[PDB]
Amino acid sequence: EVETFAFQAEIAQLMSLIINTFYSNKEIFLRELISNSSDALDKIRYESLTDPSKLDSGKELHINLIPNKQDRTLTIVDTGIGMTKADLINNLGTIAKSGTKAFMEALQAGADISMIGQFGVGFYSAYLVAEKVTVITKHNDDEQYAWESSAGGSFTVRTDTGEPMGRGTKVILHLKEDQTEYLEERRIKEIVKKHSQFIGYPITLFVEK
Ligand SMILES: O=C(Nc1ccncc1)C1CC1
Numbered sequence: 001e002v003e004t005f006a007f008q009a010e011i012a013q014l015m016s017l018i019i020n021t022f023y024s025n026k027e028i029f030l031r032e033l034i035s036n037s038s039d040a041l042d043k044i045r046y047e048s049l050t051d052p053s054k055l056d057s058g059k060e061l062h063i064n065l066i067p068n069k070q071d072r073t074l075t076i077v078d079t080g081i082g083m084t085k086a087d088l089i090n091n092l093g094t095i096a097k098s099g100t101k102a103f104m105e106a107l108q109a110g111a112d113i114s115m116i117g118q119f120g121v122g123f124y125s126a127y128l129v130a131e132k133v134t135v136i137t138k139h140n141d142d143e144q145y146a147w148e149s150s151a152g153g154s155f156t157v158r159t160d161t162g163e164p165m166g167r168g169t170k171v172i173l174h175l176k177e178d179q180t181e182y183l184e185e186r187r188i189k190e191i192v193k194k195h196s197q198f199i200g201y202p203i204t205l206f207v208e209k
Helices: 009-020 028-050 085-089 096-108 113-119 122-128 177-183 185-195
Strands: 002-006 063-068 073-078 130-138 145-149 154-159 168-175 203-205
Touching: 009 096, 009 122, 028 063, 028 073, 028 113, 028 122, 028 168, 028 185, 063 177, 063 185, 085 130, 085 145, 085 154, 096 113, 113 122, 122 130, 122 168, 168 177, 177 185, 185 203
Parallel strands: 063 203
Antiparallel strands: 002 154, 063 073, 073 168, 130 145, 130 168, 145 154
16 A cells, blocks of 8 residues: 655755756765764654663664665664654654755855755755665654655655564665666765764664675
8 A cells, every 4th residue: 555645846856956956966865865864863862861762662772874785775874863764754743844945045145065964854955866775764663664766746655564663764875877886885985074074873874796
């Protein structure tokens, strides 16, 4: 049972700008997704300070980067607070409509495109490198769900029958044909060191056979 939803117009417009604007600095997608994971980890850590049972779904707070050259996917896994079904539908837990508006106003006032994450919509920078994004998520208060979009104005949400996750979020980037440099260990290591070197959770880059 798959539900198909239209993006709000303002979000669809931001996605079309990300996909169609000529912009060579595509590597910042990973900084943005790691930053989002760090924010989600901070949220479950804070909730656990007064309710330790919130970590019954998993005590380890970490970020894994999993390239798969056979599937041409880069997966960013975190064990943060995760998202409910309602969060997924509501722009993956973001204030994307007002965030997009503030980002566009900032660009008019001289901000850089790379500042997207300051406006709460850094997730959508995934489409700098991905033709399709799949988000699998488990929040303590809901079941495990899969969100997916290839842009084009729509996204889908379904219950996920896949490998149970415990708690957290997995962002699966189905990379564009010409963006497979982001599956190479040395390139991923370089971008993490450049942009994400002080994140306060362990970031493990998996290697491949
Ligand atoms: O936001 C981005 N591009 C963009 C291009 C033109 N106008 C607004 C935004 C990319 C960083 C993700």
